[PDB]
RNA sequence: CGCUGGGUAGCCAAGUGCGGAGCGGAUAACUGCUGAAAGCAUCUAAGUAGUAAGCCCACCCCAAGAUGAGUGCUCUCCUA
């Protein structure tokens, strides 16, 4: 299952294990997550962490696999980083950068002046598609959903803000 | 007011001014972000984001008999 899998820690990724807390030190940030009340972690003198249950119960079997893949997202998050590939479908849906902010002409009256945070490096390499880059997957997903929460792709319109190779329902009439 | 014609100050509107503000807080329905119990998944079981004329606060007034009777400033207790 999920919970029995060694944490693949790559090179130049320092593991810091503290009292009820994980402090990872990757080259692209230091993510910090408090341990659950029923999960105690063990290490075998290398780049392989193993979270372990502390009590025979159901909730430790919830946060065992949950906390397992969350620490996987910690180590892979601070080592390589996660990127989302949004795409503005259609004509006039242009997206560009204002230094600290990001502006989205989406067919409204005024283009949306949505502020990117400091932890995410976004890039517009072509005027439609926007690569939201970041360390942690949850912030990339929340801000990518926040940009997505203005114009979802309508089926008859066939034209909105969708991310790459995700199947979208379309209709003929 | 004998019946009429006008009218100051009052009162009144039909007249004249003003109000109904909030990237303030938490939510209901819903859309989600990572995401496990069934190595696939799923808005949730951990955490968390947008958001209702609805709830609360802010808004105007009364208001410590709020007996839980508040707080601050100031005055006065003399003669045998």
UniProtKB/Swiss-Prot annotation:
Places the protein is found: Plastid, Chloroplast
GO cellular component labels: chloroplast; ribonucleoprotein complex; ribosome
An annotated Gene Ontology molecular function: rRNA binding
Keyword field: Chloroplast, Plastid, Ribonucleoprotein, Ribosomal protein, RNA-binding, rRNA-binding, Transit peptide
GO aspect biological process, one term: translation
Subunit description: Component of the chloroplast large ribosomal subunit (LSU). Mature 70S chloroplast ribosomes of higher plants consist of a small (30S) and a large (50S) subunit. The 30S small subunit contains 1 molecule of ribosomal RNA (16S rRNA) and 24 different proteins. The 50S large subunit contains 3 rRNA molecules (23S, 5S and 4.5S rRNA) and 33 different proteins.
Family: Belongs to the universal ribosomal protein uL6 family.
Known role: Component of the chloroplast ribosome (chloro-ribosome), a dedicated translation machinery responsible for the synthesis of chloroplast genome-encoded proteins, including proteins of the transcription and translation machinery and components of the photosynthetic apparatus.
Protein name: Large ribosomal subunit protein uL6c
Gene designation: RPL6
């Amino acid at each position: 299952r999920i919970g029995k899998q060694p944490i693949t820690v790559p090179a130049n990724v320092a593991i810091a294990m503290e009292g009820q807390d994980l402090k990872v030190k990757g080259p692209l940030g230091e993510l910090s997550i408090t341990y659950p009340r029923e999960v105690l972690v063990e290490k075998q003198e290398s780049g392989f962490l193993r979270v372990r249950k502390a009590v025979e119960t159901r909730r430790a079997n919830q946060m065992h696999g949950l906390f397992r893949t969350l620490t996987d997202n910690m180590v892979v998050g601070v080592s390589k980083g996660f990127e989302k590939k949004l795409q503005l479908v259609g004509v006039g849906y242009r997206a560009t950068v204002e230094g600290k902010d990001l502006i989205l002409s989406l067919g409204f009256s005024h283009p949306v002046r949505m502020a990117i945070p400091d932890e995410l490096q976004v890039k517009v390499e072509e005027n439609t598609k926007v690569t939201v880059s970041g360390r942690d997957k949850s912030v990339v997903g929340q801000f990518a959903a926040t940009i997505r929460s203005w114009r979802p792709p309508e089926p008859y319109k066939g034209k909105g803000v969708r991310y790459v190779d995700e199947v979208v329902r379309r209709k003929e009439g």
